[PDB]
């Protein structure tokens, strides 16, 4: 469903403690590719209603988890299936590829 926003605090709830899948985009305002991909991230997440809890994590404001996971370059779109991580996409992508990539993990 539509992509939410997270930070260190909320991430715990919205991601680690999630029931349904999650798609967290580690972004930042300086991250040009992240910004132009974000609409794509959202609309795809809209298509994947109910299950795909899409979200956006500000990497500058929430470096914490980025450091824990080992992330720096962004966009870094991590996938979770139920609390725990499953996959991760890095860099800009064409929507068709994103869609397919999501589908093979979800449906």
Curated annotation (Swiss-Prot):
Main location per the UniProt record: plastid
Shown segment, full-protein numbering: 34 to 140 of 140
**Where's the Thioredoxin domain?**
2-107
Q: What does this protein do?
A: Participates in various redox reactions through the reversible oxidation of the active center dithiol to a disulfide. The M form is known to activate NADP-malate dehydrogenase.
The subcellular location is:
Plastid, Chloroplast
Which cysteines share a disulfide bond? 31-34
A molecular-function term among this protein's GO annotations: protein-disulfide reductase activity
Q: What is this protein called?
A: Thioredoxin M-type, chloroplastic
This protein's UniProt keywords: Chloroplast, Disulfide bond, Electron transport, Plastid, Redox-active center, Transit peptide, Transport
Query: In this UniProt entry, which residues are annotated as the site Deprotonates C-terminal active site Cys?
Result: 25
One Gene Ontology cellular component annotation held by this UniProt entry: chloroplast
User: Active-site positions, per UniProt?
Assistant: 31 (nucleophile), 34 (nucleophile)
Source domain of life? Eukaryota
In chain numbering, the residues marked as site (Contributes to redox potential value) are: 32-33
The record's similarity note reads: Belongs to the thioredoxin family. Plant M-type subfamily.
The annotated subunit structure for this chain is: Forms a complex with heterodimeric ferredoxin-thioredoxin reductase (FTR) and ferredoxin.
